[PDB]
Amino acid sequence: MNFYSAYQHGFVRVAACTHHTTIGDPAANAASVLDMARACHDDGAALAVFPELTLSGYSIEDVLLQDSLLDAVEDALLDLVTESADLLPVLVVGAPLRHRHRIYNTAVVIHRGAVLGVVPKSYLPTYREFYERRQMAPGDGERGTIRIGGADVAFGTDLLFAASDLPGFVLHVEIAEDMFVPMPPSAEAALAGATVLANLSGSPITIGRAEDRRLLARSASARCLAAYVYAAAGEGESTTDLAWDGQTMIWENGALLAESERFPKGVRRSVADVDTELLRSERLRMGTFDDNRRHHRELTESFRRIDFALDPPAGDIGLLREVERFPFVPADPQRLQQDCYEAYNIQVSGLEQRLRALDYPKVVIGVSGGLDSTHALIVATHAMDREGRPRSDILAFALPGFKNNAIKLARALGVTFSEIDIGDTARLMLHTIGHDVTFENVQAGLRTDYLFRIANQRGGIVLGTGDLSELALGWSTYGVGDQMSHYNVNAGVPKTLIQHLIRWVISAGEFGEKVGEVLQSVLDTEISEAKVGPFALQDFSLFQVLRYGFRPSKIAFLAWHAWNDAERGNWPPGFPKSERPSYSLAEIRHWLQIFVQRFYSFSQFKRSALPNGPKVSHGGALSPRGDWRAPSDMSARIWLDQIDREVPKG
Amino acid sequence: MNFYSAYQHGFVRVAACTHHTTIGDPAANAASVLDMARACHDDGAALAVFPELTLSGYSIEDVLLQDSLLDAVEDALLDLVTESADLLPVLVVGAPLRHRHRIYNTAVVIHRGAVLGVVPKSYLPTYREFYERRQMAPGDGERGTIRIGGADVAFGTDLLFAASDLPGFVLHVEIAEDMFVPMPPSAEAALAGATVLANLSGSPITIGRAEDRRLLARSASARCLAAYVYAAAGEGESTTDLAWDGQTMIWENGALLAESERFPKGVRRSVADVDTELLRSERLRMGTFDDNRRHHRELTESFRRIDFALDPPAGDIGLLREVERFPFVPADPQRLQQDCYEAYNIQVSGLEQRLRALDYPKVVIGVSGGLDSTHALIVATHAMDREGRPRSDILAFALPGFKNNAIKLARALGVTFSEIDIGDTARLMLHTIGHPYSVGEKVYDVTFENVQAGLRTDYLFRIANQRGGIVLGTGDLSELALGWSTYGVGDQMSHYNVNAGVPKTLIQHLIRWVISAGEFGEKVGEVLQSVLDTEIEAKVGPFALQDFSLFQVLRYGFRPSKIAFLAWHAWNDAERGNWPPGFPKSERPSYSLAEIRHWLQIFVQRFYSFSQFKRSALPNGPKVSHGGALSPRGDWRAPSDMSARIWLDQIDREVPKG
Amino acid sequence: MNFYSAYQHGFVRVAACTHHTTIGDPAANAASVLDMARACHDDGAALAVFPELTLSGYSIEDVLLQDSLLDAVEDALLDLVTESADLLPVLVVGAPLRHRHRIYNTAVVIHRGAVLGVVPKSYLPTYREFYERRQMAPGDGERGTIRIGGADVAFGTDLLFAASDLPGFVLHVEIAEDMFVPMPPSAEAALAGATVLANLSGSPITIGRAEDRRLLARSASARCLAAYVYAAAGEGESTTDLAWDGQTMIWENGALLAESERFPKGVRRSVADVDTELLRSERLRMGTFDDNRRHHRELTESFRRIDFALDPPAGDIGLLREVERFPFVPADPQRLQQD
C-alpha cells in the first residue's frame, strides 16, 4: 500500500466550482466549465459540482423557451460529454433539457465520456423573486429514461451514483430549492445510501441569504451524516433584477471543510478531501439513522443505483484537509473558551448532584501539586460554593512518601489542609511482604487506603483525579491505588485539555488573584511521557479510536499530517515556540504500537471497575457503563499486525 | 387494599376441566359441564376450559352430521348460557355449530349470561386415526359473526377476550391440532396481546402422546410468555377405535402449575393461580418479543378485542400456587444437583479464561475459614487443575487482625499457604488517623472495622503485584445486593470475582455438592464438611429472606407488597411446602408477616438507594443464576444516587403491620 | 445401487461444531474453523454449523465496531471461502459483516469455493446480559444482495439452500434469539420447504439455560417436522461478565440424535445421520402442516431458493445413528416402564 495516498485512506477529493456565466451562450459556458474541470482533474478530484442551469445561465427567464437556446445547450452538453473521456472527475453540470412535454431544470451527471444520469429539480419556487414554474416542469415523481445524444440514460429524482472501486462514495444530486423544503430529496437519498450530497444552486444573493444557505447545507450534512457540496452562480448572471455572489462550499457531518470568496472577480473553486471513513463510522454507530431508513423502507428501497469506476490517482497528492493536532483542544480561541466553559460546568454540576444526594458529605482529596489534583480541587471548591457549603468541608491532604503549590493553593482557597506522611506505613508494609512496581504501588495504594479511611472516619467521600488519557492507557494503580475513588471529576477530561481548563479558571478570575497566582505557578512548574509516550499523540489516537474506530494506519496518516510540521496548521493558545514539537512518522508509529497494545489489550480491566463521574467530550468517555464496552481479556495482535504491514518504518 | 386477596396481587385463578362425556347426548354433557362450572365458581375461578366438542362428544364421527344431534347441541348450549348468568368464570365449551354451509368444530366462550364469541378450530387433522375434514369445515380465515340463540356474536380465529377490570388477563382460544402446526393461531394471538392461551382438546391417547402434548403446551407457554391451559377428553368418549386419558394441565412461561390424574375414574380439574404480573414483567423486558410483533404487524393488528367485566372475589381465597422458599435453591434434589453442577462449572470456566488470557498468573486469595472464601478456593483449585497448572501457584493467605479450617483446607489441597497478621499495620494506620482506639478507646465503629478490611485487600493486592498474581474476589451476590462489603479499599474490590453471581443461599449447597461428588478426596471432603458444620450480621436480616426479595426484584421488578405476599405464602409455615436437601428441622424457621415486612423495608432501602455505588465499580466475574446478576455492565443498570422513598411508601400504605 | 451407503438411503450427515474462540482475532478463529471443517469433510458430512459470530468472537462488544476488526473478519472469511473449494460440506460460519449503514450479525453459507448466501440475525436481544442492538442492526425484512469479495450474493432472512442432487436436504439458517420468539424465521422456512434448520448460537450459559435451549430446539424440530442443528460458543469467549459451555446438539422431529460434552476442554462436534425420508414421510401424512403453509402463502412463497450440488460420497461410511432393534419396545427402562 501507498501510505501517502489520500485515496488509499478512504478520502475522496471533491470540488464545488463557480464558473463564468455568459447568459444565453451555452458554448461559452461549456468552455468555462471545461477549463475548471481540467483543473479539478489536475487536482485529482473525483467530483466537480457546477451551478444551477450552468449551460444556459439561470437568470434568462423566457429565453429558456427559445428553440435556438435549447438547441445550443444540447450541442454544448454533448461536446462536454465527449471531452470528459479524458477527465478524472464525475462532472455534475446544470442544463435546461427537454423531456416529454416540457423542459426540466436538470443536473447532468457526466463521467468519462458518458452521461450516467439526468436529475431534474423537484421543487420550483414561484414566489417573491422566483418564477421557475413559468418555464420549467417539476421533476418530483419522474422516473424512467431520457434520450441524450442517441442514448437512453436514467432520468429522475431517485438516482444514486456509486463508485464501484470506492464503496464509501455514493453520490446523490439535488437542486437549489430542493434543499429548503421540510422533506428534501437528499434526506431520503442519505437513508438509501448516499454519502455525498451535491447541490447545484442559482441563488440570487440577498441580505441574509448566505446565512440561510449555510444553516441548511450544514444541518443537512449533520442530519444526514454526509458530505454536502454546494455551488452557486456568480459573475455573468443577469442583473436586470438580481445580484449574485458565486458562493461555493463543502460541509462534512456539520463541519465546514472549505468555502470560497463571496463576490469574487474571476472563477472560484472549493476543493476538499472528504473522509468517507468518518461518515461510514458515524453511520455504523448511530443505530437510529438506520431505524429511520427502515421506517421509510418503501421510499428508501426504490432508488436506482448507477455504477461507475472512478480509478483515482494512487500516488501522493497531499491532503486537502485541516487536521488539528489536538482533537480535544480547538485551535480557535473562541471555540476553546466555549469548550472550557462547558467542560468545567460538567465536572462541577456532576459533583454537585453526587454531594446533594449524599446529604453534603465532606470531600476528601489528595493534593500533590500536580495539574490533575489541582484542577480537581478547584472543581470541588466551586461545587461547594454553588451548594452553599463551607469550604472547610473540603479535606485536602498532602501524602508524601519517598507541592508547596499544594499547601499554598489549599491555604489560598481556605479549605481544610493537612499532611500525612505514608512512609512509615509503607516501610512496615514492604517489610511484612518481604520486599519497581511493587515499591511504587505500595505507596500509591497506601495513599488511597488512607483517604478512604479518613472518608469513613470523617463522613466524607474520596474524590478521584485520574484523567481520561490515564484511563485510556492504564497508567494508574488498579483497585488499591489512584484508579479507585468515590467520585471521579477528571475521568472524562483528557490530559491535553486539563491545562487549558486551569488557564481558563485563571483568566476568568472569580477565585481571586492569590488563587490565580498559585494556579499560574502550578502551570509554570508542571509543564511518564517517558514510557507511554507524549500525551499529545496518545490523546490524538484516543479520539480516532473512541469516536470513529479508525484502523491504525489511518490514525498514523492523520497524526502525521497534523504533527509532522510545526509551522503548518494552528496551535491552540498557550504554546510558546520552544513547546511546539513536530513528530516524525517513525515516532508516531512507535507510540501508536504502544497505544494499541495498551488500549485494546492491557488496560480495559482497569476501566471495567470504574468509579462514577460525568462524560465530558463529544469524543466520548471510557466508562464501561457508557461509551466503551470491551473485553478485559483480549489481545491486540491484529492492530499490531496492521501497523506492521501498512505503516512504513519511517 | 386486601393484602390476603390473590386477585389484588395480579393473580388470575384458572381451571382446565375434564368432564364426563356421554356421546350423542348434549343435555347430559351440559349437566356434567354445569356441575364442574359450579365447582370452578365456588373456587373463585375466572376461567374454565373444557374438552374439544364438549357438548356432543368428540368421537362420534358421522353422527355429528345428524340434525337431531346438531339441534340438541344448540338447545343444550343455550341452557348453559342461561345458567352462566350466576357463574363467576368465563366458560370455554366445545360444540359442533352450524354456520353458513357447514358445521364448525368450535369453542363457545360464555360469560355471565352471554356468548362473548365463538372460535372455530383452524386445522382439521385428516390422517392416521383422525378424520375431521370429513365432517367439519376449517375455521382458518373465517371472520364476521355467527347467530346463536337470536344474537349475532363474534365468530373467528382472530378473537381476544380482555377483562376490563383485570388488564393482565387477555384470553385467546385455540383447539387441539391448532397448537401442533409450525405457525399456530395462539403464537400470533400472544404477539397481539393474549396472556392466557386456552386449548380445548379431544386427543385420543396413544403411547408417547402425553409427552408430545407436554412438549408443545410447555414450549408454547415459554415462547409466548403466557399461561397455557389445556383440557383433554376422558371417560365416556367412544372406544370403538381409540382410548382417552382425560389429561388436564396448566403451564406458565415454561413451568407446570398444575396437572390432573391420567386415566381417572370420575371428573377431574386442574386449578392454579396464574401470575399475570410475572407474564407482564417478562414481556416488559424481552424487547425482541415486541420486535417480533412489529415484524408481523398486519397479522397482529387485525385481532378483535371483546371486552368483559370479570368482577372477581375480593377476599382471601388462598393462593393455589407452589411458592418456593428459595428462588435460587430448587427443593427438587435432581434439579438442585443440576443447578450446582452448572453454577460450579460457570465459576471455574470463567476463572480459567481469565487465567489463560493473563498467561497463567499466580492466584492470590484470602482464606478466612468462611463459606465464601472456602468455596472460592475450591473453584480456584479446580480451575488450575483443568488448565494443568501446579496447585502451588495458588497463594492462600490467612490475615488475622483483632480458621484452622482455613490452614487445614489449604494443607489438604496442597496450595501455597501463609499467614500475615495485619494487626500492627492496622494499629499504625489507626494512630496516624487519630482514631480513639490507638489511644486505648474501645470504639469499634465502621472505621475500626474498615481499616482492617481495607488492609487485607491492600496486602493481597501488593502481593499480587510482587508475585505476579491476581487477587480473587469472594464476596457473594447477596452481599452485592445489600451493600454488605467494604467499598473500594476493602473486600468489594479484586481482580476477578468468582462468587459475584452466586447468592449466599446457594453457596452452602455448592460446597455440599463438591463434598458429595468427592473428586478432591476424603481429607478435603472432611475439612469442607467441617467448614459447613462450623459456619451454619443480622443487621441486614436473614439471607433466606433477602435472597427471596432479590430474586423478585431482579427478575420481575415486582412491587414491595407483591413481594411480601409471595414471601409470606412461602415462609409463614415451616410444615407446608418442601425444603431443599440439607435442612435439619431445628433449621426450618418460619417468618411472620411483621418480620417479612421489617426485612423488606431494609431490603428496598439498601438495594435501591444505599448500595448501588458499590456495584457501580465492580470487578469482572461470570453471571450465574437465571434470576440475574448485579453487574452494571450486565443485568443491572441503575443510578448510584437515588432515593428509595416510593418503595418504602408502598410498603407503608399496602403491607399490614403484621 | 450401493446398499451400504447411507447417502443412497436418504441419509444426510450433519455436524454441529464448537470451535476454539480467540476473541478479536479472526485469522485464529478461521484456523480453528478450517481444522474442524477438514474433520467434518473426512467424516463425509454435508453440513457443518459453527457458533454465532464465529469469526470475531461473540462476546467482544464495542470491539465489533473497530475497523481493523471488521477488516480482519473479511480477510479471514475470504480465506475460508478459498479453502472450501476442496471441502465436501456446506459451512455455515458466523461473522459481523458491513452492509449499507451498519454491521449485521450474520451467518455466511459457504460451499465449494463460493458464498451461497448471507443470513442476518432477525431479532437482537437488548435486555438482561444482552446488548446486541448497540452494535448491530436487525436483519428482519432485509432482502437483496451483499457484496462479498467482489461478488453479489444473496442476502436476507428469506433464503433456502437446496441440494440439487439431494432433494430431501433443504437448509434454512437462523441465529440464536431467532428461535426464541413466538413466530421464528425457521417456522416460516419449514412451511416453505426447509427440512434442515440450522442455528448459530453465542448463548452465554446460565443456570437452567441448557434446559431452555433444549426445550426450544426440540419443540422446533417436532413442530416443524425437521432436523434442528444447534451450535453454541465455548472456550475462548470473554469471561468479563459471562461463562460459556460450548453445547452442541442435533434434533430430528422431536428426538435427540446427538449432543456433545458441556464445558469441554478443547473443540467438540456433534455428528449424526439425519434421515431425510423420515422427515419427508411425516410431512407426506400430516396434511395440516401443508394447510398451515397455504394459510400463510404470501409469507411462504416469497423465499428464494439457492441451488447447489452436494455430490456426497457414494461408498460405505457407516451410519451415525442409533437404530433400536425394537421400534415398539424402548431399550431405556424408564421409557419402557412409561410405555
Ligand SMILES: Nc1ncnc2c1ncn2[C@@H]1O[C@H](COP(=O)(O)OP(=O)(O)OC[C@H]2O[C@@H]([n+]3cccc(C(=O)O)c3)[C@H](O)[C@@H]2O)[C@@H](O)[C@H]1O
Ligand atoms: N486483564 C487483567 N485482568 C485482571 N487483572 C489484571 C489484568 N492484567 C493485569 N492484571 C493484574 O492487575 C495488576 C497490575 O495493575 P496495577 O496494579 O495498576 O499495576 P501496573 O499497571 O503494572 O503498574 C502501574 C503503573 O502505572 C504508573 N503510574 C501509576 C499511577 C500514577 C503514575 C504517575 O504518573 O505518577 C504512574 C506507574 O508507572 C506504574 O508503572 C497485577 O496484579 C496484574 O496481575
Ligand SMILES: Nc1ncnc2c1ncn2[C@@H]1O[C@H](COP(=O)(O)OP(=O)(O)OC[C@H]2O[C@@H]([n+]3cccc(C(=O)O)c3)[C@H](O)[C@@H]2O)[C@@H](O)[C@H]1O
Ligand atoms: N452513593 C455514594 N457514592 C459514592 N460514595 C458513597 C456513597 N454512599 C456512601 N459513600 C461513601 O462510601 C463509604 C461507605 O461505604 P464503605 O466504605 O463500604 O462502608 P459502609 O458500607 O458504611 O460500612 C461497611 C459495613 O459493611 C459491613 N461489612 C463490611 C465488610 C465485610 C462484611 C462481612 O462480614 O461480610 C460486613 C460492616 O459491618 C459495616 O456495617 C463512605 O466513605 C461514604 O461517604
Ligand SMILES: Nc1ncnc2c1ncn2[C@@H]1O[C@H](COP(=O)(O)O)[C@@H](O)[C@H]1O
Ligand atoms: N506526595 C504526594 N502527596 C499527596 N498526594 C500525592 C502525592 N503524590 C501524589 N499524590 C496524589 O496521588 C494521586 C496520583 O498522583 P500521581 O501518582 O503522582 O500521578 C493524586 O490524587 C495526587 O494528588
Ligand SMILES: Nc1ncnc2c1ncn2[C@@H]1O[C@H](COP(=O)(O)O)[C@@H](O)[C@H]1O
Ligand atoms: N481473618 C481473615 N483471614 C483471611 N482472610 C480474611 C479474614 N477475615 C476476612 N478475610 C477476607 O475478607 C472476606 C470478607 O470477610 P470479612 O472481611 O471477615 O467480613 C473473606 O471472605 C476473606 O476473603
